[PDB]
């Protein structure tokens, strides 16, 4: 993520996790 | 130049230029990222043609 112009900062969810924090 | 192909069908919507382009890239079977990288490329060909 260096190169691309104007490229903000967020979070992606993941559907995993929750099912396997269990 | 300001709002690309929706001001022949409804009202006018604006965009800007690098979105446009992409959008043009990918409707001929070109993944959207390659207009991303090399834009600076593009655009100095674009001025010499």
Do not use: H
């Amino acid at each position: 993520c260096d190169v691309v112009i104007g490229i903000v900062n967020n979070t992606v969810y993941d559907p995993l996790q929750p099912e396997l924090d269990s | 130049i300001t709002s690309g192909w929706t001001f022949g069908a409804g009202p006018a919507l604006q965009i800007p230029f690098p979105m446009q382009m992409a959008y043009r890239f990918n409707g001929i079977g070109v993944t959207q990222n390659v207009l991303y990288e090399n834009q600076k490329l593009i655009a100095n060909q674009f001025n010499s043609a």
